[PDB]
Design an enzyme around this catalytic site. Structure first.
Site, PDB file in Angstrom:
ATOM      1  N   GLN B  11     -33.478 -41.466  -2.508  1.00 40.24           N
ATOM      2  CA  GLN B  11     -33.978 -41.351  -3.872  1.00 40.24           C
ATOM      3  C   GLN B  11     -32.847 -41.439  -4.886  1.00 40.24           C
ATOM      4  O   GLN B  11     -32.973 -42.124  -5.906  1.00 40.24           O
ATOM      5  CB  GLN B  11     -34.747 -40.043  -4.045  1.00 40.24           C
ATOM      6  CG  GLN B  11     -35.168 -39.772  -5.474  1.00 40.24           C
ATOM      7  CD  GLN B  11     -35.924 -38.472  -5.617  1.00 40.24           C
ATOM      8  OE1 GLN B  11     -36.089 -37.729  -4.652  1.00 40.24           O
ATOM      9  NE2 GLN B  11     -36.387 -38.188  -6.827  1.00 40.24           N
ATOM     10  N   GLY B 137     -31.221 -36.097   3.136  1.00 37.95           N
ATOM     11  CA  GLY B 137     -31.405 -36.395   4.541  1.00 37.95           C
ATOM     12  C   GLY B 137     -31.321 -37.874   4.847  1.00 37.95           C
ATOM     13  O   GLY B 137     -30.466 -38.301   5.630  1.00 37.95           O
ATOM     14  N   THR B 138     -32.210 -38.666   4.243  1.00 41.45           N
ATOM     15  CA  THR B 138     -32.164 -40.108   4.459  1.00 41.45           C
ATOM     16  C   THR B 138     -30.876 -40.704   3.905  1.00 41.45           C
ATOM     17  O   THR B 138     -30.176 -41.435   4.610  1.00 41.45           O
ATOM     18  CB  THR B 138     -33.395 -40.787   3.849  1.00 41.45           C
ATOM     19  OG1 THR B 138     -33.270 -42.209   3.976  1.00 41.45           O
ATOM     20  CG2 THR B 138     -33.571 -40.424   2.387  1.00 41.45           C
ATOM     21  N   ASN B 199     -22.716 -34.148  -9.618  1.00 45.46           N
ATOM     22  CA  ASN B 199     -23.714 -33.919 -10.657  1.00 45.46           C
ATOM     23  C   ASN B 199     -23.208 -32.927 -11.695  1.00 45.46           C
ATOM     24  O   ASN B 199     -23.461 -33.090 -12.893  1.00 45.46           O
ATOM     25  CB  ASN B 199     -25.018 -33.427 -10.035  1.00 45.46           C
ATOM     26  CG  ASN B 199     -25.604 -34.416  -9.057  1.00 45.46           C
ATOM     27  OD1 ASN B 199     -25.353 -34.340  -7.856  1.00 45.46           O
ATOM     28  ND2 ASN B 199     -26.389 -35.356  -9.568  1.00 45.46           N
ATOM     29  N   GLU B 247      -8.094 -57.002  -4.217  1.00 45.99           N
ATOM     30  CA  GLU B 247      -6.965 -56.492  -4.988  1.00 45.99           C
ATOM     31  C   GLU B 247      -7.118 -55.000  -5.238  1.00 45.99           C
ATOM     32  O   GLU B 247      -6.146 -54.239  -5.151  1.00 45.99           O
ATOM     33  CB  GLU B 247      -6.859 -57.237  -6.318  1.00 45.99           C
ATOM     34  CG  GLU B 247      -6.646 -58.732  -6.187  1.00 45.99           C
ATOM     35  CD  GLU B 247      -6.570 -59.437  -7.524  1.00 45.99           C
ATOM     36  OE1 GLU B 247      -6.748 -58.766  -8.560  1.00 45.99           O
ATOM     37  OE2 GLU B 247      -6.345 -60.665  -7.540  1.00 45.99           O
TER      38      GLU B 247
HETATM   39  N1  LIG Z   1     -26.631 -38.259  -9.908  1.00 46.44           N
HETATM   40  C1  LIG Z   1     -27.856 -38.225  -9.372  1.00 46.44           C
HETATM   41  N2  LIG Z   1     -28.116 -37.418  -8.348  1.00 46.44           N
HETATM   42  C2  LIG Z   1     -29.401 -37.511  -7.937  1.00 46.44           C
HETATM   43  C3  LIG Z   1     -30.397 -38.305  -8.448  1.00 46.44           C
HETATM   44  N3  LIG Z   1     -31.578 -38.109  -7.751  1.00 46.44           N
HETATM   45  C4  LIG Z   1     -31.275 -37.219  -6.841  1.00 46.44           C
HETATM   46  N4  LIG Z   1     -29.975 -36.802  -6.911  1.00 46.44           N
HETATM   47  C5  LIG Z   1     -29.320 -35.842  -6.037  1.00 46.44           C
HETATM   48  O1  LIG Z   1     -29.686 -36.116  -4.713  1.00 46.44           O
HETATM   49  C6  LIG Z   1     -29.298 -34.971  -3.919  1.00 46.44           C
HETATM   50  C7  LIG Z   1     -30.248 -34.828  -2.761  1.00 46.44           C
HETATM   51  O2  LIG Z   1     -30.444 -36.121  -2.166  1.00 46.44           O
HETATM   52  P1  LIG Z   1     -31.804 -36.872  -2.500  1.00 46.44           P
HETATM   53  O3  LIG Z   1     -31.520 -38.275  -2.900  1.00 46.44           O
HETATM   54  O4  LIG Z   1     -32.648 -36.011  -3.367  1.00 46.44           O
HETATM   55  O5  LIG Z   1     -32.462 -36.918  -1.067  1.00 46.44           O
HETATM   56  P2  LIG Z   1     -32.363 -38.194  -0.138  1.00 46.44           P
HETATM   57  O6  LIG Z   1     -30.928 -38.512   0.012  1.00 46.44           O
HETATM   58  O7  LIG Z   1     -33.275 -39.204  -0.706  1.00 46.44           O
HETATM   59  O8  LIG Z   1     -32.959 -37.623   1.225  1.00 46.44           O
HETATM   60  P3  LIG Z   1     -34.466 -37.247   1.579  1.00 46.44           P
HETATM   61  O9  LIG Z   1     -34.695 -35.832   1.154  1.00 46.44           O
HETATM   62  O10 LIG Z   1     -34.620 -37.434   3.048  1.00 46.44           O
HETATM   63  O11 LIG Z   1     -35.260 -38.223   0.796  1.00 46.44           O
HETATM   64  C8  LIG Z   1     -29.267 -33.797  -4.905  1.00 46.44           C
HETATM   65  O12 LIG Z   1     -27.936 -33.330  -5.058  1.00 46.44           O
HETATM   66  C9  LIG Z   1     -29.795 -34.411  -6.206  1.00 46.44           C
HETATM   67  O13 LIG Z   1     -29.287 -33.788  -7.361  1.00 46.44           O
HETATM   68  C10 LIG Z   1     -30.112 -39.158  -9.537  1.00 46.44           C
HETATM   69  O14 LIG Z   1     -30.866 -39.940 -10.121  1.00 46.44           O
HETATM   70  N5  LIG Z   1     -28.786 -39.051  -9.937  1.00 46.44           N
END
Ligand SMILES: Nc1nc2c(ncn2[C@@H]2O[C@H](COP(=O)(O)OP(=O)(O)OP(=O)(O)O)[C@@H](O)[C@H]2O)c(=O)[nH]1
Ligand SMILES: Nc1nc2c(ncn2[C@@H]2O[C@H](COP(=O)(O)CP(=O)(O)OP(=O)(O)O)[C@@H](O)[C@H]2O)c(=O)[nH]1
Lengths: 427, 432, 53, 427, 439, 190
Positions: B11, B137-138, B199, B247
């Protein structure tokens, strides 16, 4: 008669060569389209030195453009002089060397060397009597510093007697613009000492200093620096294209410069460089030209010439002047700066007078100085290389392309010898 | 002739890619439907359909289909190739093993097939861009598997990963230390340059600068898109001293394992304050090195710099850059290792940044993106190591991983690998 | 939009040395200042006189 | 063969010098751009006195422009004949001395005088044989007076045997525009007495009176006053630049006019001064020309010569005329006013006749006089200084830069000694 | 090349600064938006704008001003008004609570909260400029913020900059008009600091300008806007010599050298003589002699004291527009021959005449008429001691019962400071009395 | 001066109307002639008028916050050589206009940012032709245009060819005719 082949390697060398061709075409009255628009017969008598006749009044320069990144060739093609060069003379690769000497010298440029040599040979055999090669490149980069050295080695193997002129831009600590430039600089200067016969050491820091102080330019773009280098290059070979009172070609210059085979590095300069405001209020004479050629600030190398004794020097004057004035100026400079000149050579400074000045210029003087001050630059590069090689800072990026660790030790071995040889005759 | 494949995983990666592709379309003038009204810069990021429509060269994969379906119902649904938006059925539930051994393998074949299809159509492949989040996770497990297979297949190509490092205290998951620890091992082997961001650091940037106190994940992303666009701009825009990915790697990566640079964008100020501030090259260069301007929640002052890349954009004169770098080097606070006397690499591009409409950033004439390979990130990895130790002392949530087909000893292996990496930075940071 | 398209440059490509080298340009001319402007009034009054002889 | 170096200090000095160079260029046919547009070969000959050479018949003045405020340099450059000067000669500080003699003589003047002397000696060494230095400044101001005295002292230290002439604009109570100008004048009189060879004291009240009663100038701005002073400056040196029946250079004038080393404070004048209405109603032959020369209302020092016996006089004529008429008029003017001349000196007037009159006049006669009427001109300043020093008014400004009341007392005593010396030969 | 920094403190200082900056924006052709519509005004002698307005990289012009106030009402009015985009957002320094007409509150308690930020902003502006001539400080001389915070900032700037010029334009309390019941206390408490930390305290009274508007401009019921515009006109005419070309330029340093005889005698009287309505402009001849005479009349002074009872020490005339120095010399001669205008015997000449070639500019909708000539007559006179005598009398009457003392002593002030300030003011008036005595 | 390019093959007619979009399309990468002409003409105008800095640059025009229209005169001489004979730049700016009786205004008015003619043919019917063509293209009369600091040449040109006098010296360093009925008055004198 005494044709010259010009090769542009790397981004810096390619841009310098482009500006050089602009300057030469302006001097010889060659239109950017390649046509002749000049008004003097002397602009055409020795046009064969740098150009090839295309029949229908078109004169294609004898230039070979090489760079592993096609962006430079694309920019040159889209530039004002895209149609000037031969379209098949742009020998470019697919991806750049990545500021990696190993890549360009061993694999990535190694594929291209065959085609580059083929085009160089095709240009060479078309000449009536070849004089030498002009190769412009930068020591700090990867593709320039690698392909230039490999091509120089191949040319020297193929052409043992023809003179070799290289106008190499050397990195400086104050304009340090690459993390791994000392490695490429040493690995290139090894081949330069081995093969070439005359290297003009240009330095970006000195050019910036000249543009800021002498010309008083607030924003020195790369066009200005390349124009300075182009004016120097045009001044060097002005006796091959325009008759003068005392002619001095490339081979005569080389004979008068080097006392020993490995001391063939020079610091050039330009005399009539004047500010915008002071241009009208400064009387240009043989004295002013001479004391500006021998001025420390006017040198195009970061090392101060006043720190080491001069081995040989030569100013190639352009324009109408009295040889008595030139000889008196040389004698006066020799007498004043007796501490800055070697004792074991009786007459150090050479002279040459050319009748035709640069276009729009009343008179000019291109200075070439073989001094031991270049040992300071070589020491700086050697110290940087030693600092980055104690801990093997970036060695793996070079060993990944087929080098051994011992080669870098050998490359630095000759720098100590090269510095010692220059320091040997300094007092 | 110089084009880069971009892959978004998870995500966080997909949402970052949304802003990245919006920014690319704005920069190249491509309308969100994929049609460009009105000249070869788009070849790096987009492909030609032969009918005037330009499609991005991106593969978007996520086990959960919610975000991808949201995009497919969104405004930018017409850009990407419809059948390269690869989706699964259920997410990895913030579990590395779920996204690596059980659910990820069912879709890894299709993902690799689509990546290979893009690569075959490619002619001047420069590298890989992968966007993911360590905590997820993913985005951890599937990213590990995918980039492992990519390293196997295309080991001769550069791999650039833009990961979302977990913040020191700001977190949204309870098992993110486990996932980040597990991903640390696999980023060392395959990833060539990992530009992680925090973040919390971007939150602090959006708070202090830009005068925004409620920044969402739509503002953090835009900044990451600006960073990646500034990195790639040397491949599609002409300029003096352009910096390619090769580079970039040569100048920035001293050792095979020391390849974890930071990221920073200095000219980030509010519109009301942008007009009244003189944004000279010296000013932006000076504020690149501020501790509170780095996009990772770490103090660069404690660490020692090893390699710095400055990718200037817009109205920039090389003399000004050289003067600014001399001024920076004269400052003792910014400490460089003694074995790298010339740790500066400069890329000057003539294309100014493109400001997104309705965005938080103002129009500026010049901009610089400073990527520094410093040892300050060892603090972040140390705090993550401490978190993992605290959770693994009692073996909190390892039973999910064991039941998903993962050995317990793999956690200890990843822990010792991260400890070895921290020891590597501690060793390298010592002067000669 | 049109402004979103890539922007070319000329400031890097300016070659000011060519103008400096051309010593043949000796125009030495400047436009007259505004007579009512303070600098024009100063030029007329402090740096100017009326013919007496 | 007798080149003269010109120095401009302060705003008044800069403006008077600009007007002087305008008039000189008008006489020599020099274009405002520096080119030569004259028609008589006499102007081109002996042009080296005021103009150097820059090639292609371009000449730049041997002038040094000095002031602590860059605004004066900007005004000079923007003004007419601004392009005439050389930018290297423009030497300036950060801020003006602020009407403070100490500021312009001890700290800011000391900081700038190094550069000023460097420029002056660089110009002087380019001369074949310098006749001397002439300097223009104002005693009332701080920058002008202070740094002018400093320059006079330093030049006299560097060139003891050369002629130093200063055209000082002395302050007057009637046209006083500075509150602390008596202090600066009192401080500068001592240096002027000690180091200058001959000073041409000039007052704004006298010039305004001339513009009002001799001419019919309505609202006479500073340009007209500067033009009159410029005409005098050009007249007193016409023999060094043009032929003549009886030539007289600056040293000859000093020998004739200076009986004692301190009594060298002159009194300038211009003879052909007639209003625009009384142009055709009066001839400009020698008799009325000399009568206007010796007329009390035609003096630029604002002190009536009738109140003091003339010590020596010198009328430098220009244009074609007869020596017999000139000698007759000088003898008549000495005989008819024997009470106005010292009896112990037999001949009180020195005659000099040039050949080239100013452009636009059939003949001209610049009159200089070493009359004892300077007693009043300096006594007014002495009275003002006494009144101000009685209560130490404005003295903290001077002492803030490292001054003492002892210096002020010494300067007042020196001025009193000068006026007493003049009164000794008064009657 | 030559730059000045303007500091406006308190409500009166900020409003006078609004007037001054409106006038400067008109003078240099700068819109309230901060953009200069003329591109060709960036070259030649037109570089006068660099004195007051700094240039940014976006083409806008940022004034070199610091607006500081303990209360945010007036600064919020600025931020909402027409000049929202002109001033730099971080230059509009605000607090959270006003000084409540308490010198101690503005000096220590609320002062120390934002004195560091004020000094930081001032230092940031000073670093950017390279030819800093000095500081122009605008404040009210009888308020709470404009007294306490002004004293604190003045002492800090004197410590941190030293020789740099500090010109103060203070609204000295009127002899009868008084909008604050406790203003003498603040006035005398700050007159001790402004005496040893300023260079030219150009003091102004409200009642004097009220009378000037009543008798010259025929404005029976004026307000603070007219007074602020007149003060802005005076300041612009003073600083005209720093940016405009003209014979007999007057820099700040020569201004102080010629006008200030003794270190403590630096309290001049500022007046703008050519004040007249548009209706009476046609009938008036507006000659140089007439304007110079209007300078010296008691009805044109902007401090309500009788100049006849005192002797002028030094007078500085800063003319504008079409002015010929011969006319000025004639006017000075006529002034000198007048027996009513008494000068001290120890100052034979006391007229530092400055002339400029920039005619005065008139703001649209203003009361002032368009004139070809203007001048500011700034005289260091002994007659100003009467204002301090009145202030001392008021302070003694109010302090005999020790009224309002608890307000001040509740914020760290001690009555010893009151006694010290009163003694300092008595010493200053004694110095004026003793210097005014002829030798 | 002169430029070595076929300006005939890049410009439809002798007078070329170039906007911000037109100059963006005519990029220096592939169409360097137009950008070089703009820069050279701007530098020549700045040198002739004595300004401390150049006011007309291609780079400074493409990145400007508001659209501007520039005019240049080109004449092909001999094949690949062409000469430049003038430069005109006009744009639309919100001016804080004022008139007699201290009137106030806010109406947008046309601006002549630059007006340079080559000294060889300054009075040879070139400036009048450029200005007339600009008026025809913009369909705007002189009565609603503002001049930025008109040098004496500009007002004498207006006197000789349009009989427009009583130019008001705006506080914005601009100059306009006596016609101010373009818009209403935000603030009347009284
Ligand atoms: N900078 C930033 N961090 C994000 C964003 N969306 C999610 N996160 C961060 O993603 C982290 C968790 O990973 P996620 O992407 O939510 O989960 P995933 O990696 O998709 O894994 P699953 O739970 O299996 O789907 C957290 O620290 C969130 O704050 C975004 O648009 N920008
Ligand atoms: N006859 C002239 N007198 C002048 C002229 N300019 C100034 N003056 C007078 O000279 C006197 C001194 O003024 P200055 O401007 O020279 C002060 P100065 O420049 O010497 O010092 P700074 O002002 O500190 O630079 C004063 O009485 C002026 O009225 C001029 O052009 N002609």
């Amino acid at each position: 008669m005494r044709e010259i082949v010009h090769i542009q390697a790397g981004q810096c060398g390619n841009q310098i060569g482009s500006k050089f061709w602009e300057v030469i075409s302006d001097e010889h009255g060659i239109d950017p389209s390649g046509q002749y628009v000049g008004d003097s017969d002397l602009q055409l008598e020795r046009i064969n030195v740098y150009y090839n006749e295309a029949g229908s009044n078109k004169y294609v320069p004898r230039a070979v453009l090489v760079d592993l990144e096609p962006g430079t060739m694309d920019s040159v093609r889209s530039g004002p002089f895209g149609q000037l060069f031969r379209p098949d003379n742009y020998v470019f690769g697919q991806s750049g060397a990545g500021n990696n000497w190993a890549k360009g010298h061993y694999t990535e440029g190694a594929e291209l060397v065959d085609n580059v040599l083929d085009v160089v040979r095709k240009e060479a055999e078309s000449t009536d009597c070849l004089q030498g090669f002009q190769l412009t490149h930068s020591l700090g980069g990867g593709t320039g510093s690698g392909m230039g050295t490999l091509l120089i080695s191949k040319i020297r193997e193929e052409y043992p007697d023809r003179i070799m002129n290289t106008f190499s831009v050397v990195p400086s600590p104050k304009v340090s613009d690459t993390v791994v430039e000392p490695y490429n600089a040493t690995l290139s200067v090894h081949q330069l000492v081995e093969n070439t016969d005359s290297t003009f050491c240009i330095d970006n820091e000195a050019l910036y200093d000249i543009c800021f102080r002498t010309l008083k330019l607030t924003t020195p773009t790369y066009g200005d620096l390349n124009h300075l280098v182009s004016a120097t290059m045009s001044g060097v070979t002005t006796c091959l294209r325009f008759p003068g009172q005392l002619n001095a070609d490339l081979r005569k210059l080389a004979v008068n410069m080097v006392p020993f085979p490995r001391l063939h590095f020079f610091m050039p300069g330009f005399a009539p460089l004047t500010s915008r405001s002071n241009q009208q209020y400064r009387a240009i004479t043989v004295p002013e030209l001479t004391q500006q050629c021998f001025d420390a600030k006017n040198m195009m190398a970061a090392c101060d010439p006043r720190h080491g004794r001069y081995l040989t020097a030569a100013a190639i004057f352009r324009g109408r002047m009295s040889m008595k004035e030139v000889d008196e100026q040389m004698l006066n400079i020799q007498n004043k700066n007796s501490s800055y000149f070697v004792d074991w050579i009786p007459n150090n400074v050479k002279t040459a007078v050319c009748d035709i000045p640069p276009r729009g210029l009343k008179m000019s003087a291109t200075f070439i100085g073989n001094s031991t001050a270049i040992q300071e630059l070589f020491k700086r590069i050697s110290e940087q290389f030693t600092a980055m090689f104690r801990r093997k800072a970036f060695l793996h990026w070079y060993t990944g392309e087929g080098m051994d660790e011992m080669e870098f030790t050998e490359a630095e071995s000759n720098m100590n010898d090269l510095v010692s040889e220059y320091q040997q005759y300094q007092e | 002739m110089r084009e880069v494949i971009s892959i978004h995983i998870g995500q966080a990666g997909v949402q970052i890619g949304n802003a990245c592709w919006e920014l690319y379309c704005l920069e190249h003038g491509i309308q969100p439907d994929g049609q460009m009204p009105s000249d070869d810069s788009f070849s790096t990021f987009f492909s030609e359909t032969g009918s005037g429509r330009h499609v991005p060269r991106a593969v978007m994969v996520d086990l959960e289909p919610t975000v991808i379906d949201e995009i497919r119902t969104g405004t930018y649904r017409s850009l990407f190739h419809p059948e390269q938006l690869i989706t699964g059925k259920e997410d990895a539930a913030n579990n590395y093993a779920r996204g690596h051994y059980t659910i990820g393998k069912e879709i890894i074949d299709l993902t690799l097939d689509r990546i290979r299809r893009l690569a075959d159509n490619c002619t001047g492949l420069q590298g890989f861009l992968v966007f993911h989040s360590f905590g997820g996770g993913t985005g951890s497990g599937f990213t590990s598997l995918l980039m492992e297979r990519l390293s196997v297949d295309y080991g001769k190509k550069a791999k650039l990963e833009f990961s979302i490092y977990p913040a020191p205290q700001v977190s949204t998951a309870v098992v993110e230390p486990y996932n980040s620890i597990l991903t640390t091992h696999t980023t060392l082997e395959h990833s060539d340059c990992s530009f992680m961001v925090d973040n919390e650091a971007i939150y602090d940037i959006c708070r202090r600068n830009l005068d925004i106190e409620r920044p969402s994940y739509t503002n953090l992303n835009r900044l990451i898109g600006q960073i990646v666009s500034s990195i790639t701009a040397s491949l599609r825009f002409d300029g003096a001293l352009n910096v390619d990915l090769t580079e970039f790697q040569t100048n920035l990566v001293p050792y095979p394992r020391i390849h974890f640079p930071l990221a920073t964008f200095s000219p980030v100020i509010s519109a009301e304050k942008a007009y009244h501030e003189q944004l000279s090259v010296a000013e932006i260069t000076n504020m690149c090195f501020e501790p509170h301007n780095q996009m990772v929640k770490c103090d660069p002052r404690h660490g020692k710099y090893m390699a710095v890349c400055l990718l200037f954009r817009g109205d920039v004169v090389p003399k000004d850059v050289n003067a600014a770098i001399a001024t920076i080097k004269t400052k003792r606070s910014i400490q460089f290792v003694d074995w790298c006397p010339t740790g500066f690499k400069v890329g000057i591009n003539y294309q100014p940044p493109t400001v997104v409409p309705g965005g938080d950033l103002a129009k500026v004439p010049r901009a610089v993106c400073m990527l520094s390979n410093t040892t300050a990130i060892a603090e972040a990895w140390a705090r993550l190591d401490h978190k993992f130790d605290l959770m693994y002392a009692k073996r909190a949530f390892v039973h999910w991983y064991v039941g998903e087909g993962m050995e317990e000893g793999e956690f200890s292996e990843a822990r010792e690998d991260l400890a070895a990496l921290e020891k590597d930075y501690e060793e390298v940071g010592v002067d000669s | 939009s049109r402004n979103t398209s890539p922007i070319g440059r000329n400031r890097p490509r300016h070659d000011s040395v060519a103008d400096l080298m051309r010593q043949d340009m000796l125009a030495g001319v400047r436009a007259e200042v505004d007579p009512n402007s303070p600098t024009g009034l100063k030029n007329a009054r402090d740096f100017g006189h009326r013919r007496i002889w």
